[PDB]
Amino acid sequence: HWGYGKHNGPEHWHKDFPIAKGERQSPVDIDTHTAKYDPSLKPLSVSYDQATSLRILNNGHAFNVEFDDSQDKAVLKGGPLDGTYRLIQFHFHWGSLDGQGSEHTVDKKKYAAELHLVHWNTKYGDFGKAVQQPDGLAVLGIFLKVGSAKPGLQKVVDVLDSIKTKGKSADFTNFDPRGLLPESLDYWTYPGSLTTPPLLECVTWIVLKEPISVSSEQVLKFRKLNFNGEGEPEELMVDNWRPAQPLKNRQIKASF
Ligand SMILES: [Hg+2]
Ligand SMILES: [Zn+2]
Numbered sequence: 001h002w003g004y005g006k007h008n009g010p011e012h013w014h015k016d017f018p019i020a021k022g023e024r025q026s027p028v029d030i031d032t033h034t035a036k037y038d039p040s041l042k043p044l045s046v047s048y049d050q051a052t053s054l055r056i057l058n059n060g061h062a063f064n065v066e067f068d069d070s071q072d073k074a075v076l077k078g079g080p081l082d083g084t085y086r087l088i089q090f091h092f093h094w095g096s097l098d099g100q101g102s103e104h105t106v107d108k109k110k111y112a113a114e115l116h117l118v119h120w121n122t123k124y125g126d127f128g129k130a131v132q133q134p135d136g137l138a139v140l141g142i143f144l145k146v147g148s149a150k151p152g153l154q155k156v157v158d159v160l161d162s163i164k165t166k167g168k169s170a171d172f173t174n175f176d177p178r179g180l181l182p183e184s185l186d187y188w189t190y191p192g193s194l195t196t197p198p199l200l201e202c203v204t205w206i207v208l209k210e211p212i213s214v215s216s217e218q219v220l221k222f223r224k225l226n227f228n229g230e231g232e233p234e235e236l237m238v239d240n241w242r243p244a245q246p247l248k249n250r251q252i253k254a255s256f
Contacts, residue, residue, distance in 0.1 A: 002197045003061065003227065010242045017199045024201045025245040026192035027103035027141075030252055035188055038253035044185050044206065045077035046140070046178075051087060053175040056159055060166030060227055061196060062091040062240055065156065065175060069120070069127065074177065076119045076138050079255065080189045080204050085119035085138040088127050090177060092116070093195075093241035094222045098146045103195050103241045104207055106143075111211055112219060113144035114241070115180060116195075131200050134191075141207035142182065149215035152179020157221050166229040182210040186256040195242045209256065 002008050002016065014020035051074035057064045066089045067074055074087035094113035095101030102111035117140040120130040130136030144150075155175055162170040186209040193201045225237035 004240045013197055013199065017197050019193070019199045019201060020197075022193070022199070022201055023248055024191050024193055024250060025199065025248075026195050026203065026205060027105070027242060027244055028190065028192070028247050028252070029105045029108055029244040030188050030207065032107055035252040035254045037256060038189075041080060041189070041253065041255055042078040044079040044187065044255065045075075046181070046185070047077070048074045048087065048176070048178045050074065051175070051177055053172055053177075055169050056156070056163055056172035057169040058163040058166055058225065060229070062093065062237070063160070063163055063225065064089045064091045065172055065177075072122065076117075076140065076206070079187070079206060080253070081138055082135070084122045086122055087177070088118050088120055090115060090117045090180070092144070092222065094144070094219060094238065095241065096223065096236075096238040098216075098219070100239065101241055102143055103244075104141055104143070105244050111143040112146045113214070113222070115142040115144065115212070116140070117142075117177065117180075131194075131202050133202055135204065136200075136202040137194075138204045138206065141205060142180065143208070143211035144214050144219070145211045146216055146219060147213035149218050150180070150212050152176070153214055153218060157218050160221055160225060163225075164230075165226045165232070168230070180212065182208060182212050184208070184210040186210065186254070188252050188254055190247075190250050190252045192250075209254075
């Protein structure tokens with residue numbers, strides 16, 4: 001099954017998931033000079049005040065922070081979006097060194113990491129129905145770079161010893177995702193996909209222009225995680241990012 005190594009990596013995924021070479025695949029390079037400021041775009045609404053996290057899981061490709069999504073509690077609205085999208089989970093992709101790690105790129109510049117906050121369109125009733133829909137999902141993408149530590153991230157950095165290997169989860173209630181955002185909500189937006197199999201083309205991507213900075217020591221602990229399951233030989237969880245995919249004449253819009 002799919003991974004990020006030589007043999008099961010991003011190059012291979014088209015074999016089980018043909019949409020891997022589809023028409024609206026993610027991530028992409030964001031060429032700042034080609035993106036159009038779009039005046040028909042509403043303000044963005046991230047209402048993460050009443051977020052109910054439940055747990056952190058190592059699924060063997062990343063770790064997921066999972067939220068209670070059966071009421072309108074942590075929701076994205078506005079910008080390119082029609083209606084309400086509920087936060088289901090968040091996770092990151094990161095590199096082996098600071099010069100790589102992000103999935104999206106800005107003028108071919110790769111960031112040390114990248115955060116995804118994943119949301120589903122309410123009206124479809126559940127996350128499973130939503131993924132079968134062209135407007136089923138909304139993902140907030142936030143770049144990370146190395147500098148000063150992000151204090152809103154340390155809670156996550158500190159539970160990661162508990163979830164070293166695939167399968168493991170800890171309780172992770174009462175986490176506030178508002179502590180992961182940068183100060184500006186300027187974003188680029190385009191129609192796109194999930195970045196891991198099954199690569200469903202169900203995502204409106206909202207990618208923030210302003211990176212968050214984390215510490216060398218923060219990202220070092222991401223790199224101490226394992227892809228493998230307990231009692232298997234050690235495969236460091238690093239470089240779990242898909243590279244930039246062909247834009248195929250979709251237009252990336254800037255909110256700014
Ligand atoms: Hg879809
Ligand atoms: Zn992701």
